């Protein structure tokens, strides 16, 4: 865990602020139900099993609960709500082989061959319009994100 190292005391101060209002019972350590309360306020509904794993990854002391050093590791990994967005940003690169920041019909052809999902020169040009709104034949992060949100 190198998280406190990548931050300043200015930010670590803000993290003990973010720890104190997070810890409802006021014991100075965040349990599964306490995780479950504050994360549920952000539009999430996690089970005791999930919050347990959120602990087990960051729990270098192995007690079954979060302390301040564990939190600088934990909340940093949660600061990306649906962090799989970065995985689809990676998918945007694999789709953009020429690596210019927008997808074309011939670009969907050359990625679908590697995916094992080979689509016709027509079929790929259809996907361009299924995700992109403006009809330029080009798919950038703004219009691309539509198909990733639709699923
Ligand atoms: Ca507590
Ligand atoms: Ca712990
Ligand atoms: Ca491209
Ligand atoms: Ca477009």
UniProtKB/Swiss-Prot annotation:
Ca(2+) 1 binds at residues 23, 25, 27, 29, 34. The gene is CALM. Residues 10-45, 46-81, 83-118, 119-151 form the EF-hand domain. Keywords: Acetylation, Calcium, Metal-binding, Methylation, Repeat. GO terms for cellular component: centrosome; cytoplasm; myelin sheath; protein-containing complex. Pfam families: EF-hand_7 (PF13499). Ca(2+) 4 binds at residues 132, 134, 136, 138, 143. GO terms for molecular function: calcium ion binding; CH domain binding; disordered domain specific binding; myosin binding. This is Calmodulin. The modification N-acetylalanine is found at residue 4. Belongs to the calmodulin family. The modification N6,N6,N6-trimethyllysine is found at residue 118. This protein has four functional calcium-binding sites. Ca(2+) 2 binds at residues 59, 61, 63, 65, 70. Gene3D superfamilies: EF-hand (1.10.238.10). Ca(2+) 3 binds at residues 96, 98, 100, 102, 107.
């Amino acid at each position: 865990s190198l998280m406190a190292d990548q931050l300043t005391e200015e930010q670590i101060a803000e993290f003990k602020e973010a720890f104190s209002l997070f810890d409802k019972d006021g014991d100075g350590t965040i349990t599964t139900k306490e995780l479950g309360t504050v994360m549920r306020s952000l539009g999430q509904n996690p089970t005791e099993a999930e919050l347990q794993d959120m602990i087990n990854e960051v729990d270098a002391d192995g007690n079954g609960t979060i302390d301040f050093p564990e939190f600088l590791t934990m909340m940093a990994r949660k600061m990306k709500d649906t962090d799989s967005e970065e995985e689809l940003r990676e998918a945007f690169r694999v789709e953009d082989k020429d690596g210019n920041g927008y997808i074309s019909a011939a670009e969907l052809r050359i990625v679908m061959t590697n995916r094992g999902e080979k689509l016709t020169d027509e079929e790929v040009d259809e996907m361009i319009r299924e995700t992109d709104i403006d009809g330029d034949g080009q798919v950038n992060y703004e219009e691309f994100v539509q198909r990733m949100t639709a699923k």
